[PDB]
Enzyme design. Structure first.
Site, mmCIF file in Angstrom:
data_model
loop_
_atom_site.group_PDB
_atom_site.id
_atom_site.type_symbol
_atom_site.label_atom_id
_atom_site.label_comp_id
_atom_site.label_asym_id
_atom_site.label_seq_id
_atom_site.Cartn_x
_atom_site.Cartn_y
_atom_site.Cartn_z
ATOM 1 N N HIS A 48 0.797 -1.215 0.000
ATOM 2 C CA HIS A 48 0.000 0.000 0.000
ATOM 3 C C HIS A 48 0.828 1.263 0.000
ATOM 4 O O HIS A 48 0.319 2.322 -0.402
ATOM 5 C CB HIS A 48 -0.993 -0.020 1.157
ATOM 6 C CG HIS A 48 -1.963 -1.120 1.092
ATOM 7 N ND1 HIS A 48 -3.007 -1.288 1.974
ATOM 8 C CD2 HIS A 48 -2.042 -2.142 0.172
ATOM 9 C CE1 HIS A 48 -3.674 -2.375 1.613
ATOM 10 N NE2 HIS A 48 -3.097 -2.895 0.562
ATOM 11 N N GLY A 67 5.010 6.500 -5.007
ATOM 12 C CA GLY A 67 5.418 5.103 -4.921
ATOM 13 C C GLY A 67 5.922 4.739 -3.546
ATOM 14 O O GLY A 67 5.292 5.028 -2.533
ATOM 15 N N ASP A 194 -4.348 -19.052 3.511
ATOM 16 C CA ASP A 194 -3.890 -20.381 3.118
ATOM 17 C C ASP A 194 -3.615 -21.150 4.407
ATOM 18 O O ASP A 194 -3.593 -20.595 5.484
ATOM 19 C CB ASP A 194 -2.749 -20.398 2.150
ATOM 20 C CG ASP A 194 -1.323 -20.292 2.630
ATOM 21 O OD1 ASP A 194 -1.038 -20.188 3.828
ATOM 22 O OD2 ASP A 194 -0.442 -20.308 1.739
HETATM 23 CA CA CA Z 1 1.544 -20.261 3.126
HETATM 24 CA CA CA Z 2 3.547 5.736 -1.018
#
Ligand code: CA
Ligand code: CA
Ligand code: HEM
Ligand SMILES: *[C@@H]1O[C@H](CO)[C@@H](O[C@@H]2O[C@H](CO)[C@@H](O)[C@H](O)[C@H]2NC(C)=O)[C@H](O)[C@H]1NC(C)=O
Ligand code: MAN
EC number: 1.11.1.7
Length: 336
Positions: A48, A67, A194
């Site tokens: 993020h 960025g 998972d």
């Molecule tokens: Ca995993």
């Molecule tokens: Ca940023």
């Protein structure tokens, strides 16, 4: 070539500061070099932070974001109000204090903490670590982080704008191998994505392809889909990406090889790490990042499920020979 004060040998004196950051993070942020919620939160944060980068906005006469600039920390007031940035403030504040204490840029620190945190998770590749990103940032524009209710078209378009091909989107999503949710369904906090949220392995790619049969909580949270067994959460975007013709072959190719998955992830993460920056202007301090303990477990289809429970979605490639297990279906404990 160079020797830092702690008799730490390294390639460049700009790396020396990072050994102290390593020790601090491993002791404190990572609570003794563990692979638990702080790494998982840091992976959300690195994404993020970095994905607040939009050439399309720049082309439309607007600031598109800097960025991997640490803006999610420096301008956390603004950015943690974004829909996808919930559940991060406590981690952001920990990072803020480390960054100020050691005098490193917020953008470098996020990248560093990512590499360090990955290094605590069995099976991880050794992520690159570059230092030298300016600590200066402007707030990310809003609406640049893909959300779990987005269509694949939307996700690929956004990620594509930032610079990623569909394959790389899939590759970056290997981080959902070390993942849970807390904010989508409050009733099953830290339900993993998972079966091995503390192992950087291909289980995420396998298990997202299993037929959705199970509602892990008493009701559905936001962007929640049926999962393949109790305790596992499936978000809609992952479900869709596993199955979408644009991403399904890459997704399927992840399933049998932890080693190819790790290479691909490392590469994609290196690319993400320098959105907004010239990597050639940064200093490579990758040697500060140790290798992770190896993962010796084999990819498996859990719980007595078989390839018949896989919704094979790459129409040109047979599903890889992946070992099955004994039933019954597992019930995943909350990720630690
Ligand atoms: Ca995993
Ligand atoms: Ca940023
Ligand atoms: C491609 C689009 C992606 C979408 C829509 C997406 C969406 C989400 C959502 C909704 C959550 C649950 C957060 C919560 O409720 O606590 C999650 C968790 C997570 N995401 Fe993603 N994600 C994506 C890509 C990535 C990428 C590229 C990375 C990092 C390289 C990443 C790393 C993680 C991790 C590690 C978690 C687990 C957090 C935890 O266990 O606290 N995600 N993601
Ligand atoms: C990176 O820039 C941020 C400002 O965007 C600096 O953070 C401030 O640090 C001061 C001085 O320590 C603290 O009083 C403020 O709380 C911090 N603000 C925020 C928003 O975090 C940070 O010090 C700069 N880092 C370096 C290495 O210069
Ligand atoms: C099966 O058991 C696990 C705990 O061992 C839960 O996390 C899951 O929700 C299901 O009850």
């Amino acid at each position: 070539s160079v020797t830092c004060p702690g008799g730490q040998s390294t390639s460049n004196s700009q790396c020396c500061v990072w050994f102290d950051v390593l020790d601090d993070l491993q002791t404190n942020f990572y609570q003794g070099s563990k692979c638990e919620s702080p790494v998982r939160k840091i992976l959300r944060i690195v994404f993020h932070d970095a994905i607040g980068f939009s050439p399309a906005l720049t082309a439309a006469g607007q600031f598109g974001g800097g960025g991997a600039d640490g803006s999610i920390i420096a301008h956390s007031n603004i950015e943690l109000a974004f829909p996808a940035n919930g559940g991060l403030t406590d981690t952001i504040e920990a990072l803020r204090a480390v960054g100020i204490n050691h005098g490193v840029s917020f953008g470098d620190l996020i990248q560093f903490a990512t590499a360090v945190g990955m290094s605590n998770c069995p099976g991880s590749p050794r992520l690159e670590f570059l230092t030298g990103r300016s600590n200066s940032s402007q707030p990310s524009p809003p609406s640049l982080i893909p959300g779990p209710g987005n269509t694949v078209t939307a996700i690929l378009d956004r990620m594509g704008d930032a610079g990623f091909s569909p394959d790389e989107v899939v590759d970056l999503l290997a981080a959902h191998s070390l993942a849970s949710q807390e904010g989508l369904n409050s009733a099953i906090f830290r339900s993993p994505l998972d079966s091995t949220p503390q192992v950087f392995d291909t289980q995420f790619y396998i298990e997202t392809l299993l037929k959705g049969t199970t509602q892990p909580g008493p009701s559905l949270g936001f962007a929640e889909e049926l999962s393949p067994f109790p305790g596992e959460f499936r978000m809609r975007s992952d479900a869709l990406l596993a199955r979408d013709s644009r991403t399904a072959c890459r997704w399927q190719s992840m399933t049998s090889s932890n080693e190819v998955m790790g290479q691909r992830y490392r590469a994609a993460m290196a690319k993400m790490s320098v959105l907004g920056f010239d990597r050639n202007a940064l200093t490579d301090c990758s040697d500060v990042i140790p290798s992770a303990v190896s993962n010796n477990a084999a990819p498996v289809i859990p719980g007595g499920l078989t390839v018949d429970d896989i919704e094979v979605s790459c129409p040109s490639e047979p599903f890889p020979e992946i070992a099955t297990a004994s039933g019954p279906l597992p019930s995943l404990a909350p990720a630690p």
